[PDB]
């Protein structure tokens, strides 16, 4: 009996460690004897440790995660794809946590519950990746969402943070209701919620004239929920406001991990299921809309956070082009894009968090940065050029695939849109470089140097961004492996 | 069978009529306190706990040890939450 | 179904009479403890006092203050009174003596109890009076707080019985009354019943002398009477529930032919009378808690103990395989 | 007919939820909607869910809403607006949803037209399933804690998040 | 609202639901014609596909 | 598809489901399992049964 | 409760025990398992101590970190030992001990 | 006709929630209430389908969805409370400062 639970050792450990940290934090934060010490950094270090131990347990036990698969079948499904997705999710969570300590001590954000909520949301996203039934998928999505709602409003006396939370909760709850409605329609039409059963029922028919309008609209509503989650246009406008109004570590965490989890869900639901061309057309139109709107709105922005939010919207458009084309290379390119975008976003938010120690808000606040911190201005410039997709930086992969699929699926309007939006993006990315290097403002802002954690993370992500294309084989092989494991 | 609910409806109708008769015969001759929200939240949580207890209580003879320990784990999570509330002063009305 | 209204009236009317005389019995017992005589002028031994008080109330002009919640103000007492009445549809007085033999009767009683709070809340809010509103909020919070412990004790009984059917709960006590092994649970249940019915030592609405205005202070004539009647009917119901769950309902004390001679309804009535006497006795014996103290007792004492009893009973019954 | 009555009550009560000027009144109508829903559940034979909808939706959730809305003391000027200018946008959105979504089951689940013949005699009774009938409660409890226990525990995690968030966002200890 | 207003709205809603019942009966009665139209269009499409495949 | 019935016995449409699943588990073309699939879906919704009975009712209303 | 240990991906090494008992797995702990266990626990205690200095709770922080490390290290050692007995990990020692007793 | 009548009941509840979103641009509390209405309609959809299909999966998920609805309302009302506390008002013009 005990050995059956080897399939959930990683999750058991992280949940138990989260409980231990909750108890530790609440017991000593309330201690008069110790004079109510702030425990955000102490619990943060212990939680980073817990995340790393979870990663060790998961990575080193790859076969064991598939033990007792028949017993666990109606609860979840673990395979190679989920293996790599969960490893990447844990790595992203560890990096995001490591970027938070200067924020904890200098702002004096003393709430250790922040770390606990991050860990519980990580548990939720882990269960999201392995979900193999509509019920499990919904429950894990809701756990993740509720944790985000709470942490988005963590600055509870701030107008901005409270506004972010309110908008997030209302729009999140609305989208979740729409998705749940879709799930109910699919169950009513097919008598099934398990992904295997849905695959068997729906395969071979798609729209064979006598199409289940119940099945067709259930798929549509579920897709609407998914598109809200990935911040695809027209279900996107929550994202810029929430990203800007939330505390910056929250914004960094939301920018990466939920995308990984929800894209795992989307792959395993749609790609593994079957209504077909309708849904790929959904993602096609949403990709085009996201690219165009992201480019234009980002061009309008004068503030750093909003610029990065709109940039992420545009990039999810680029990524969803891969899902749309419906090929093994499409899935592989989507995964490569997710990985590279995540690393670049981690780099960008490490810089943003470093600059938040002097309250960076506007793009113009970067003036004369090439004088006051030359190596920081260069590092940030490499990130921008990578965001623009200039070769040989890592960001060039997403552009290359966008056009590869445009000429592979046979889509020339898509190629035209890609060209135009890429040029617009390059303009608003090099505007930052111009501000740091070319401008001569009358008043300068002198920034405090970053802590060791962010400097090390920045140093590694900056080598990856510059040098990835010299040795890109491991990512290519692992992503091809994952794309194949979805069906075999 | 749902047959036994019909007398309840007729009982409700009669009780309502008695209420109207009794009440109608004499016509012939800005300070928000968060602790209420908090007690509402606690009641909601333990209301759901009782809700989940009901099927478990009637099903103990069939679920045996596995069901017992799964409910115990459920209770462990909820009781950790309760300990958190207790330490934070949510249960103190002074 | 044509005879169903006759059965319903045969429940409701004697219940209203019983409430009218419960008020008199409370006055009499309180007086006798206090070395005085209660009402003994209006009728022989004061037995006509309830009819006179009810007649006075119906002959009293209603006030209906100039509020903006004219409908809600009068409907709140109707709601609480109807809820007090409808719980008796599932109460069995003897084997086969019950209006609705609900399989889900225990949860139905819990639902009715949970619904009881709305009359008090709406009366407080609709009365256009800050004192009534504050008192109603405090009373509502107290009732919801003690409802948790009531529900957990219900779960303990359910674990022992394996069915939500009240008659089955009674007949599961043929071997032994549940109040013997679960005596601390019965004490907890009685105290929680006191708190849930806003009764002494938990009667905040009665604490006008303590600068705590009750939720029904703006009510006159028959709305106030409806609130009062619902409260006393709920006291009778809580006594009946204590009898059903822990004292074996209609069962005799000993399974002997001498005890089986007297009908089960009489056994049930006698146990209910004992519990009503304890209600009155407790009101006569002790002072009252403050609101904060009783809230602390609800969340810090009775909830943990109720949960612990759930765990202990279930674990013991699972271990030795004594489950129903 | 009975479903017509309950659906009419639900329709009117829901319109009152979304259109009452006073938010306290909206909460009270919401409570009427849950009562009607419970009636439907009793018609379906799901007495456990019928009772739980009263216990949780009305007994706990609506009470929370009522406590919060009552202490807010909202003035109508802060939330008033004329809705006559929304009739067209609601007309198109409602109609499209109406035409698509009230009739989605019609092609898959074609109704049996009631004929002028007693079909009740064609009801076949299998007594084998009637020897030991299961309540809704015990059928649900046979599954929640053993075969689908992981989802049960994840729901517990969701409730824990609710408790933590409620404390962290609103607590001001005296 | 007035109590009588709520009652009248309930009556109007009852009429609406009975009308919806009539609509459902109409939709059910036209299943056969819709099937016939679907079959004729399927035959036309199949004939066109077979004829164009001849070239 | 789950097999858990609402009254504590095997679900009404579970044997049809299992026949369809067992067919699809070895037939490389889903068109070979079309008949079993439409039997499963007929058990869920009774569409063809009710359509045929409505045809009978229609003819009765036409000949009266 | 019906159980089935059968994994999706078969073991690539000889199966000494398909579903080893808890105490058998613990008794199967090797020197390398104990090294992993002790290293994880020691690192966790060190992190607890160092992160606890600024709040002033280095002792209790050491205890908390040590509890996390003890649980994680035991889970990791159990994972390795059970995987060896089940044939999922290289298990030369287990096979040698099995072919003799 | 039973199943079409049970489904249109839940459907009117869902459409009412949608309309409540559409008609309440100055009243975000009612917007939250409309979202609960939609969640109730979905829950009813699962229960009706469970009976119609003779399958228990609809019932398990209905209970879990009730848990989600409870947690959602708790957290949402907390966020409402803190927004009101910061601004002293619930009017929508005081929650429009993030834009562009
Ligand atoms: C033969 C027997 C004779 C003896 C028995 C006779 C019994 C008496 C008759 C029954 C009662 C009828 C009279 C009602 C009271 C009138 C007296 C009065 O003083 O009213 C004052 C009233 C003032 O309002 P108030 O109550 O004081 O509240 C003030 C504030 O609003 C309060 O603030 P608030 O916050 O509480 O509320 C906010 C907001 C509340 O906002 C709202 O309520 C929205 C108002 C618009 C309602 C829209 C329709 C809602 C009904 C649902 C219908 C189906 C909808 C389907 C939509 C989904 C489909 C996609 O307030 C309002 O907007 C008030 C507007 C009220 C207008 C109601 C109009 C209803 C629509 C009628 C349509 C008729 C069409 C007929 C066919 C229908 C199709 C089948 O003014 C009126 O006179 C209007 C009421 C009169 C019309 C309503 C009753 C209609 C009944 C028709 C008869 C039934 C026909 C079908 C029979 C079927 C048989 C098979
Ligand atoms: C076989 C069956 C036989 C049945 C026989 C009985 C048939 C009765 C037919 C009556 C229709 C003809 C009426 C002719 C005119 C009568 C003369 C007259 O109106 O003077 C009366 C006069 C007020 O009349 P008005 O001039 O129109 O003034 C109206 C407003 O002031 C105007 O001010 P406003 O504009 O500012 O409005 C504010 C709002 C006030 O704000 C509100 O929110 C109103 C309250 C609504 C929600 C309140 C309940 C939720 C709160 C929680 C309560 C506890 C929950 C748990 C306990 C209950 C659950 C079982 O006022 C209203 O909206 C009132 C609308 C009433 C809708 C609610 C009542 C319908 C409930 C469904 C009944 C189902 C059966 C009937 C339908 C059958 C099929 C057709 O005074 C009274 O009504 C006396 C107060 C006592 C009322 C007690 C009613 C029961 C209360 C306790 C139960 C609560 C739950 C309700 C039942 C739930 C069932 C599960
Ligand atoms: C604690 C607090 C307090 C508040 C509260 O809780 C909280 O308090 C709680 C208290 C609750 C009430 C409790 C109780 C009820 C009664 C229920 O109402 C029963 C209705 C059902 C039962 O009705 C019949 O059931 C049997 C017949 O079915 C009868 O058996 C005969 O027939 C047997 C067979 O020959 C013989 O063998 C027997 O010997 C022979 O006797 C039986 O006598 C009779 O009862 C369903 O019936 C219908 O359903 C049919 C199907 O749809 C419809 O068929 C139609 O459609 C068909 C096509 O579809 C066409 O083919 C048809 O031609 C065409 O007619 C039709 O409309 C109608 O029949 C309606 C809900 C309500 C009000 C609750 C509301 C909510 C509360 C107030 C709660 C509230 C919230
Ligand atoms: C001091 O504390 C006390 C109260 O609270 C202040 C009381 O309300 C009351 C009295 C309250 C009552 C007697 C209510 C009794 C009501 C009933 C028994 C039901 C109705 C009885 C009647 C005589 C009304 C008759 C009504 C009709 C329409 C006549 C047709 C029948 C007492 C005795 C009391 O001691
Ligand atoms: C060809 C690529 C495609 C095009 C993209 C080009 C992107 C760059 C744009 C080119 C235009 C000119 C760029 C000018 C940058 C050169 C100046 C520079 O970066 O110097 C840095 C140097 O920045 C670095 O530190 C770069 C380190 C990267 C290490 C990469 C080498 C890896 C192996 C080397 C091993 C170690 C050294 C071996 C020999 C000792 C000095 O930084 P400061 O901020 O001035 O002071 C630093 C503080 N302090 C001197 C006190 C330490
Ligand atoms: C307020 C009280 C708090 C209590 C906290 C302590 C207990 C918490 C629960 C800890 C898990 C179980 C610990 C008890 C050890 C004894 C377990 C045991 O006796 O083994 C039994 C088996 O016990 C179990 O396997 C149940 C384990 C409960 C599940 C606990 C969750 C652990 C991790 C789950 C991972 C899923 C992801 C979590 C999602 C949040 C043997 O039963 P059987 O195989 O002979 O037959 C089965 C049964 O009799 C018939 O149905
Ligand atoms: C791939 C391209 C090429 C990359 C090349 C990689 C080469 C390997 C890297 C070599 C590293 C060289 C430096 C090694 C010596 C530094 C040792 C750190 C000492 C240390 O204890 O640092 C502590 C802080 O932790 C820290 O600062 C460490 C944590 C910093 C984050 C590191 C990552 C952790 C999370 C993982 C994220 C993964 C993201 C992937 C998506 C305390 O420091 P202090 O004493 O100065 O006091 C700080 C005030 N509080
Ligand atoms: C998902 C995983 C994503 C990882 C992305 C790839 C790692 C990050 C790349 C950016 C930093 C490394 C730049 C590449 C180094 C430039 C020289 C490349 C090279 O040919 O050296 C070989 C690779 O060394 C290396 O291994 C490169 C240094 C380690 C990085 C050693 O040559 P070799 O013979 O040992 O390997 C078999 C090759 N023929
Ligand atoms: C895992 C399953 C259940 C999960 C949930 C429950 C987990 C258990 C609760 C954990 C909460 C944290 C407990 C912290 C206890 C600290 C005790 C304390 O005050 O220590 C101070 C107390 C006295 O030192 P002082 O603070 O200098 O006065 O103890 C120590 O500091 C001892 C330090 C030496 C320990 C090193 C070895 C640790 C190995 C792991 C054990
Ligand atoms: C400058 O002049 C003006 C306009 O003109 C730009 C206006 O509009 C308006 C006011 C009216 C508006 C804004 C209605 C437009 C709203 C829409 C379309 C709702 C959808 C929301 C967004 C953000 C659009 C995103 C959707 C896209 C790009 C396409 C949908 C998705 C796919 C194809 C997959 C005003 C006053 C105006 O003065």
From Swiss-Prot, chain A:
It catalyses: a ubiquinone + NADH + 5 H(+)(in) = a ubiquinol + NAD(+) + 4 H(+)(out). Pfam families: Proton_antipo_M. GO terms for biological process: ATP synthesis coupled electron transport. GO terms for cellular component: mitochondrial inner membrane; plastid. InterPro entries: NADH-Q_OxRdtase_suN/2 (IPR010096), ND/Mrp_TM (IPR001750). The keyword Metal-binding does not apply. It is an enzyme of class 7 (translocase). Keywords: Electron transport, Membrane, Mitochondrion, Mitochondrion inner membrane, NAD, Respiratory chain, Translocase, Transmembrane, Transmembrane helix, Transport, Ubiquinone. It is found in: Mitochondrion inner membrane. It is a multi-pass membrane protein. Its EC number is 7.1.1.2. GO terms for molecular function: NADH dehydrogenase (ubiquinone) activity. The chain crosses the membrane at residues 4-24, 45-65, 84-104, 111-131, 134-154, 168-188, 215-235, 252-272, 282-302, 308-328, 334-354, 375-395, 400-420, 456-476. Core subunit of the mitochondrial membrane respiratory chain NADH dehydrogenase (Complex I) that is believed to belong to the minimal assembly required for catalysis. Complex I functions in the transfer of electrons from NADH to the respiratory chain. The immediate electron acceptor for the enzyme is believed to be ubiquinone. Complex I is composed of at least 49 different subunits. This is NADH-ubiquinone oxidoreductase chain 2. It comes from Arabidopsis thaliana (Mouse-ear cress).
Curated annotation (Swiss-Prot), chain B:
The keyword Translocase applies. Disulfide bonds: none annotated. PANTHER family: NADH-UBIQUINONE OXIDOREDUCTASE CHAIN 3 (PTHR11058:SF9). A stretch of 270 kb of the mitochondrial genome is duplicated within the centromere of chromosome 2 resulting in the duplication of the gene. The expression of this duplicated gene (At2g07751) is not demonstrated. It is also probably not RNA edited and therefore differs in all the positions known to be edited. Belongs to the complex I subunit 3 family. This is NADH-ubiquinone oxidoreductase chain 3. It comes from Arabidopsis thaliana. It holds the Pfam family Oxidored_q4. One of its GO terms (molecular function) is NADH dehydrogenase (ubiquinone) activity. Its EC number is 7.1.1.2. Its main location: mitochondrion. Complex I is composed of at least 49 different subunits. GO terms for cellular component: mitochondrial membrane; NADH dehydrogenase complex. The chain crosses the membrane at residues 8-28, 38-58, 63-83. It catalyses: a ubiquinone + NADH + 5 H(+)(in) = a ubiquinol + NAD(+) + 4 H(+)(out). Keywords: Electron transport, Membrane, Mitochondrion, NAD, Respiratory chain, Translocase, Transmembrane, Transmembrane helix, Transport, Ubiquinone. It is found in: Mitochondrion membrane. It is a multi-pass membrane protein. InterPro entries: NAD(P)H_OxRDtase_bac/plastid, NADH_UbQ/plastoQ_OxRdtase_su3, NDAH_ubi_oxred_su3_sf. The keyword Electron transport applies.
Swiss-Prot record, chain F:
GO terms for cellular component: cytosol; mitochondrial inner membrane; mitochondrial intermembrane space; mitochondrion. A motif (Cx9C motif 1) lies at residues 13-23. It is found in: Mitochondrion; Mitochondrion inner membrane; Mitochondrion intermembrane space. Disulfide bonds join 13-43, 23-33. Residues 10-51 form the CHCH domain. It is a peripheral membrane protein. A motif (Cx9C motif 2) lies at residues 33-43. Keywords: Disulfide bond, Electron transport, Membrane, Mitochondrion, Mitochondrion inner membrane, Respiratory chain, Transport. Belongs to the complex I NDUFS5 subunit family. Complex I is composed of at least 49 different subunits. This is a component of the iron-sulfur (IP) fragment of the enzyme. Accessory subunit of the mitochondrial membrane respiratory chain NADH dehydrogenase (Complex I), that is believed not to be involved in catalysis. Complex I functions in the transfer of electrons from NADH to the respiratory chain. The immediate electron acceptor for the enzyme is believed to be ubiquinone. Contains two C-X9-C motifs that are predicted to form a helix-coil-helix structure, permitting the formation of intramolecular disulfide bonds. This is NADH dehydrogenase [ubiquinone] iron-sulfur protein 5-B. It comes from Arabidopsis thaliana (Mouse-ear cress). The chain holds residues 2 to 65 of 83 of the full protein.
UniProtKB/Swiss-Prot annotation, chain H:
GO terms for molecular function: NADH dehydrogenase (ubiquinone) activity. One of its GO terms (biological process) is ATP synthesis coupled electron transport. Disulfide bonds: none annotated. It is a multi-pass membrane protein. Its main location: mitochondrion. It catalyses: a ubiquinone + NADH + 5 H(+)(in) = a ubiquinol + NAD(+) + 4 H(+)(out). It holds the Pfam family Oxidored_q2. Keywords: Electron transport, Membrane, Mitochondrion, NAD, Respiratory chain, Translocase, Transmembrane, Transmembrane helix, Transport, Ubiquinone. Its EC number is 7.1.1.2. It comes from the Eukaryota. It is found in: Mitochondrion membrane. GO terms for cellular component: mitochondrial membrane; NADH dehydrogenase complex. The chain crosses the membrane at residues 3-23, 28-48, 62-82. Core subunit of the mitochondrial membrane respiratory chain NADH dehydrogenase (Complex I) that is believed to belong to the minimal assembly required for catalysis. Complex I functions in the transfer of electrons from NADH to the respiratory chain. The immediate electron acceptor for the enzyme is believed to be ubiquinone. Belongs to the complex I subunit 4L family. Complex I is composed of at least 49 different subunits. This is NADH-ubiquinone oxidoreductase chain 4L. It comes from Arabidopsis thaliana (Mouse-ear cress). The gene is ND4L.
